[PDB]
Amino acid sequence: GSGASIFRCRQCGQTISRRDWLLPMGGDHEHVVFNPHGYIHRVWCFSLAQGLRLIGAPSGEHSWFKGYDWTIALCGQCGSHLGWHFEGGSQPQTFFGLIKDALAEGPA
């Protein structure tokens, strides 16, 4: 393999994204934010991610990224919750905000 830095689903090993695809939303790819119950999520933003399935309809409620609606993104292979897909925005129109602790960075 290439050894290129990629992110795998911690639960099943599926390749989900690459360090090359980190996206600095608002100036940083990492956003330490909270779900509505006060649990911290260290979210890493990516311009592209693979192997995900979206569930439900997009919502604007509690959106961490002003102007974007979110949808839950699961691993399409094992069903584990890996983060959210954001859409309806300006630049970029869509992106992924993934939970860093749900992924494992490693060599491709």
Ligand X SMILES: O=C1CCN(c2ccc3cc[nH]c3c2)C(=O)N1
Nearer CB in complex with ligand X: 6/17: 17
Binding region for Zn ion (CB under 5 A) out of 35-43, 61-69, 77-85, 93-101? 77-85
Q: Look up residue 85 and give its amino acid.
A: H
- What's the rounded Cα separation, in Å, for the pair 78 and 84? 16
Binding site for ligand X (CB under 6 A): 35-36, 62-64, 70, 84
Does residue 9 have a known ligand-binding role? yes
- Site for Zn ion (CB under 5 A): which residue of 6, 8, 9, 84? 9
Check the CA dihedral 76-70-21-7 and report its sign: negative
Backbone φ, ψ for residue 26 (5° rounding): 65, 10
Please answer whether residues 41 and 33 qualify as being in contact, where contact means their C-beta atoms are separated by less than 8 angstroms: yes
- Site for Zn ion (CB under 5 A): which residue of 78, 81, 92, 104? 78
CA distances from 76 to 33, 41, 48, 52 (A): 25, 21, 15, 5
Nearer CB in complex with Zn ion: 11/50: 11
Q: Which does 14 bind (CB under 5 to 8 A by kind): Zn ion, ligand X, none?
A: Zn ion
Nearer CB in complex with Zn ion: 63/71: 71
Q: How far is the CB of 1 from ligand X (least distance, A)?
A: 33
